From Swiss-Prot, chains A, B, C, D:
Biotin binds at residues 33, 44, 82, 98, 110. Keywords: Biotin, Secreted, Signal. GO terms for cellular component: extracellular region. Residues 4-124 form the Avidin-like domain. It is found in: Secreted. Its main location: secreted. A motif (Cell attachment site) lies at residues 49-51. Homotetramer. This is Streptavidin.
């Protein structure tokens, strides 16, 4: 992918969470996520996809990934998906919006899903 | 996972899209997505995650997955993530909300992301 | 407005909530909202806006409104906004997505906002 | 309202849009919005609501408002709703997420709604 090298590595968001990802030539994202907030400790598996042949007109690179909040320490019975774009250059960023869904009863399902936004950088 | 068997298979949404998924014992989702709408033809790779040890209190099972809208036929320079829960039983459903991000210039980035909701069933 | 008459009246969503609205010739929406779920009882003030000169090509009519969840009975320290379109005809609908924000501390602000979707009809 | 004085005035977001609002003692928001981006020129009516008796535990103040993108100059056949909270103090902010719905045909309704986030400050 044009940005395989640009995306692969360690990223940090505004909450101090850590996103460790490898971008595959085939469009795969694989890695681990450590949340600095919520019902989470240590690393969680993530997987996702990215556009491995982005536009050459200065547009960002579309990508997304998922974490299910279960590991050997805790289970928050929830999953977050991040949808966003990678923007390359001196101050590289991944700009995302996310959806966090909990498992709920049918009676609480109206309140199942949080929305928010995270900005990832290669420093801090 | 408790719902590995329940989730694995072919699902259809209200737009007539087809979601073909395998649930792994390890919490993985792998498969293909065929959209009946938008800048899409034929199948696209998907990957995601699910809660492989959900609550036993009648709650749904949290999950999510990603499609990058690139395959051998087309590239829509975009990715969608679905976040939702699997609800088992006679009329099994996956109830989701989604985020579709396009690669954009910095000037158009305010308008990069669509939001919507899809309901998947095992029939139709 | 072309749909002033179509929008004005009593609407019901899939949760059994009641949306009582008047559409003004000037694009105003005014009325009351009664939620069948959550930290709510009785009616709450709402206000919003709609497109009073929609397209004549069969498109829906864009609109939105807000409820702050404070009245003489309760205060849930939260506000919901509905964004959607009115679709006229025999089975008239308002199809919406919503954002529910709570007042939070800066530490909990990542988890401040729910997202969901409501479909309003003139019956039930 | 506790923050009637804090909210009332001129606000600016990260795109250079201008939000002119009056907060009523009754929980009303009234004013005008000028977008620096998209299919917009000059001012548009807005209305909304806020929590006029917020929590006294350091939480923000929940609020929301709507703009229908019609005025005497243009009609973008769309409406945006902002949902968020007001955070008082030396560097006062309104932190929002928004939903922009267009009027669409039933065939395009899956792609009717954008989501994003705006941060408003009293300077710039």
């Amino acid at each position: 992918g044009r940005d395989e090298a640009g995306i692969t590595g360690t990223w940090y968001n505004q909450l101090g969470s850590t996103f460790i990802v490898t971008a595959g030539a085939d469009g795969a994202l694989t890695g681990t996520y450590e949340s600095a907030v919520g019902n989470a400790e240590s690393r969680y598996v993530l997987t996702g996809r990215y556009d491995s042949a982005p536009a050459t007109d200065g547009s960002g690179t579309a990508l997304g990934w998922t974490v299910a909040w279960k590991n050997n320490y805790r289970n928050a019975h929830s999953a977050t998906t991040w949808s966003g774009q990678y923007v390359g250059g001196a101050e590289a960023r991944i700009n995302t919006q996310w959806l966090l869904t909990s498992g709920t009863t049918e009676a609480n399902a109206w309140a199942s899903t949080y929305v928010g936004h995270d900005t990832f950088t290669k420093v801090k």
